């Protein structure tokens, strides 16, 4: 007679399918009740951090890979799933994906899917602009002027939120210099002061060349989710550098007949590595002190492995890593090669991508610092030179506290 709580984040489409899956789970186990706790991405980590600090987190959580150092530096912040391998079929998940979710030999999460940020474009707006999708960084930067002149000041090749930008310029810097962004031995960023000048100078170039809204223009709209903004819905902001695993949260709010379409991935001649931010998209974890680890395990197995859970959940989290699950969704015709999300992943996997991203590159205080920094620049409060030093200094401090 078992009462479980489960949290997750995502759009309403993801909420809808998860809710149907939990109703089927309860149908399958009338002795097991699941209270569902769901929101969008915004504030979700923050609410979870409060819960975990008071020992009141859910039995089952959808978790983010970059949270592992936050909650489980020593692998003990989430229940070890090696202890519930009897309810939960672990062999369906590739051992090297499961290694991305293991900390000090403890299995902290089951990776649901993998993802990298790639370029998707509004095919309607790009058609009107008369432009081909950029194949090079130089083309991306040259696209802004064409949009601006051809279609109007309100038209932009892409919109980039600060976290997207952080990833994008890093990918460019990885292509050029082929070094990790974070030096983990020394608990600090690897870039020289000059490469940080180059990083923020690139931002300023793209903003001046009309590639994307400045953070000041972006702020003139409202506090909405980006995919919920008018200039996104009406095609004026004509693309996104986005996780393939959540691309329908974006393309579903376009004005028909507009679609998001996979763009090419810009690669500097002579680059040894595309500098993708490629990671597990999300995990399902069990609370450290859950009073029901076995029922929590059963629920995660249902959702990720069972015919019924897998069918219900569809692709609202990306392309399943579970071998049974992904085979199932291909056989039911739900996974189609031409779908932007599946095509996005295939293209990414073919890109040279040996460099892995440190979970510290996505530390929420580092991401928040980045947005502060480009806002310094856009609102004229710091020069590029000053912003680059500021970011390097304040960032190395955060890293030290984060990697503590
Ligand atoms: O919901 C997802 O599928 C993703 O959520 C997380 O990303 C955040 C937002 O949900 C997403 O719209 C994007 O803008 O980036 C945000 C972020 O990266 O923190 C995960 O980080 C993704 O891997 C994915 O699970």
Residue 367 CA: nearest ligand 1 atom is: 19
Residue whose Cα lies nearest atom 23 of ligand 1: it is 281
Task: Give the CA radius of gyration of the chain.
Answer: 21
Residue 183 is part of which domain span?
113-280+348-404
Residue whose Cα lies nearest atom 18 of ligand 1: it is 163
243 lines ligand 1 (CB under 6 A): yes
Residue whose Cα lies nearest atom 5 of ligand 1: it is 41
DSSP string, 329-382: HHHTT-S-TTSHHHHHHHHHHHS---PPPPGGGG-HHHHHHHHHHHHHHHTTSS
How far separated are the first and last CA of the chain, in Å rounded? 41
* Strand ranges, E, within 123-248: 182-183, 188-189, 239-243
Q: How far is CA 260 from the centre of its chain?
A: 17
226 lines ligand 1 (CB under 6 A): no
Q: Does residue 189 contact residue 399 with C-beta atoms inside 8 Å?
A: yes
Task: Tell me the C-alpha distance between 148 and 157, whole Å.
Answer: 9
Q: For residue 331, report the phi and psi dihedrals to the nearest 5 degrees.
A: -65, -30
- To the nearest 10 degrees (0 to 180), the angle between helices 137-150 and 193-208 is 30
Q: Which residues contact 355 (CB under 8 A, 6 or more apart)?
A: 174, 178, 180, 273, 275
Using the mean position of ligand 1's atoms as its centre, give its distance from the Cα of residue 365 in Å. Answer: 16
Q: Residue 134 carries which DSSP code?
A: P
Query: What is the experimental method?
Result: X-ray
Task: Tell me the C-alpha distance between 160 and 221, whole Å.
Answer: 14
Q: Residue 102 carries which DSSP code?
A: E
What is the sign, positive or negative, of the torsion defined by CA atoms of 37, 73, 320, 323?
negative
Task: Tell me the C-alpha distance between 341 and 250, whole Å.
Answer: 11
Task: Tell me the C-alpha distance between 376 and 393, whole Å.
Answer: 15
**Side-chain half-sphere exposure of 396, counting CA atoms within 13 A:** 15
Q: For residue 381, give both structure tokens.
A: 């409060």
Task: Tell me the C-alpha distance between 241 and 396, whole Å.
Answer: 26
**Side-chain half-sphere exposure of 369, counting CA atoms within 13 A:** 20
Q: How many domains does the chain have?
A: 2
Same domain, 230 and 255: yes
Nearest to 109 by CA among 289, 282, 283: 283
| Other CB atoms within 10 A of residue 194 CB | 9
Residue 14 CA: nearest ligand 1 atom is: 1
Same domain, 81 and 230: no
Same domain, 335 and 264: no
- Structure resolution, Å: 2.2
Task: Tell me the C-alpha distance between 398 and 171, whole Å.
Answer: 22
Same domain, 274 and 353: yes
Same domain, 292 and 358: no
Same domain, 266 and 166: yes
Q: Which residues contact 319 (CB under 8 A, 6 or more apart)?
A: 113, 114, 245, 326, 329, 335, 341, 342, 345
Task: Tell me the C-alpha distance between 402 and 404, whole Å.
Answer: 5
- Residue in 10, 41, 279 to alter for ligand 1 test, most ligand atoms within 8 A of Cβ: 41
Task: Tell me the C-alpha distance between 216 and 6, whole Å.
Answer: 38
Q: H-helix or E-strand containing 281?
A: strand 278-286
Same domain, 324 and 356: no
Same domain, 357 and 402: yes
Q: Which residues contact 160 (CB under 8 A, 6 or more apart)?
A: 168, 211, 212, 213, 240, 241
Residue whose Cα lies nearest atom 17 of ligand 1: it is 163
Residue whose Cα lies nearest atom 24 of ligand 1: it is 281
Using the mean position of ligand 1's atoms as its centre, give its distance from the Cα of residue 41 in Å. Answer: 7
Q: H-helix or E-strand containing 61?
A: strand 60-63
Same domain, 123 and 259: yes
Q: For residue 400, give both structure tokens.
A: 């030290």
Region label for 134, one of left (φ > 0), alpha (ψ between -120 and 50) or beta (otherwise): beta
Using the mean position of ligand 1's atoms as its centre, give its distance from the Cα of residue 133 in Å. Answer: 24
Task: Assign residue 317 the CATH number of its domain.
Answer: 3.40.190.10
The SS3 of residue 240 is strand
Task: Tell me the C-alpha distance between 374 and 168, whole Å.
Answer: 14
282 lines ligand 1 (CB under 6 A): yes
Using the mean position of ligand 1's atoms as its centre, give its distance from the Cα of residue 242 in Å. Answer: 8
Cα dihedral 42/47/50/54 (nearest 10): -160
246 lines ligand 1 (CB under 6 A): yes
> Dmax over Cα atoms in the chain, in whole Å?
66
Cα dihedral 323/327/330/334 (nearest 10): -70
Same domain, 245 and 393: yes
Q: How many helices (H) and strands (E) does the chain have?
A: 17, 11
Q: Does residue 344 contact residue 247 with C-beta atoms inside 8 Å?
A: yes
Same domain, 207 and 326: no
Instruction: Mark which of 347, 369, 385 sits at the end of a domain.
Output: 347
Task: Tell me the C-alpha distance between 212 and 401, whole Å.
Answer: 32
Task: Tell me the C-alpha distance between 109 and 220, whole Å.
Answer: 39
Q: Which residues contact 310 (CB under 8 A, 6 or more apart)?
A: 303, 304, 320, 322, 324, 325, 328, 329
41 lines ligand 1 (CB under 6 A): yes
Q: How far is CA 387 from the centre of its chain?
A: 25
Cα dihedral 84/85/87/92 (nearest 10): 140
Same domain, 380 and 340: no
Q: Residue 41 carries which DSSP code?
A: S
277 lines ligand 1 (CB under 6 A): no
């Amino acid at each position: 007679e078992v009462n479980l709580r489960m949290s997750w984040w995502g759009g309403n489409g993801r909420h809808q399918v998860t809710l149907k899956a939990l109703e089927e789970f309860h149908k399958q186990h009338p002795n097991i009740n699941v209270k569902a706790e769901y929101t969008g991405w915004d504030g979700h980590l923050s609410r979870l951090t409060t819960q975990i600090a008071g020992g009141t987190e859910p039995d089952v959580m959808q978790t983010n890979w970059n949270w592992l150092p936050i909650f489980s530096k020593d692998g003990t912040g989430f229940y070890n799933l090696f202890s519930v391998k009897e309810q939960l079929d672990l062999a369906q998940f590739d051992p090297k994906e499961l290694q991305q979710t293991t900390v000090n030999g403890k299995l902290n999460g089951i990776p649901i899917s993998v993802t990298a940020r790639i370029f998707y474009f509004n095919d309607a707006t790009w058609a009107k602009a008369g432009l081909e999708y950029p194949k090079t960084w130089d083309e991306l930067l040259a696209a802004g002027k064409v949009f601006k002149e051809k279609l109007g000041d309100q038209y932009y090749p892409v919109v980039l939120e600060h976290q997207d930008t952080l990833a994008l310029i890093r990918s460019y810097m990885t292509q050029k210099y082929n070094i990790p962004t974070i030096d983990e031995a020394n608990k600090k960023f690897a870039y020289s002061p000059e490469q940080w000048v180059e990083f923020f100078t690139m931002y300023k170039t793209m903003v001046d060349n009309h590639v994307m809204p400045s953070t000041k223009y972006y702020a003139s709209f409202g506090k909405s989710n980006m995919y919920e903004m008018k200039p996104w819905i009406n095609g004026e902001w004509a693309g996104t550098y986005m996780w393939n695993s959540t691309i329908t949260k974006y393309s579903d709010n376009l004005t028909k007949p507009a679609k998001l379409v996979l763009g090419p991935y810009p690669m500097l001649p002579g680059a040894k590595d595309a500098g993708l931010f490629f990671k597990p998209a999300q995990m399902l974890s069990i609370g450290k002190s859950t009073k029901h680890p076995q029922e929590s395990a059963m629920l995660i197995n249902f959702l990720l492995n069972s015919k019924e859970g897998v069918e219900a959940l569809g692709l609202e989290r990306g392309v399943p890593l579970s071998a049974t699950a992904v085979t199932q969704l291909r056989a039911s015709g739900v996974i189609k090669d031409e779908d932007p999300s599946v095509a996005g992943l295939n293209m990414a996997l073919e890109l040279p991508h040996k460099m892995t991203t440190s979970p510290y590159f996505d530390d929420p205080q580092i991401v928040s610092l980045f947005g502060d920094a480009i806002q310094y620049i856009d609102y004229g409060q710091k020069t590029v030179q000053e912003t680059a030093e500021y970011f390097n200094k304040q960032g190395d401090r955060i890293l030290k506290r984060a990697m503590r």
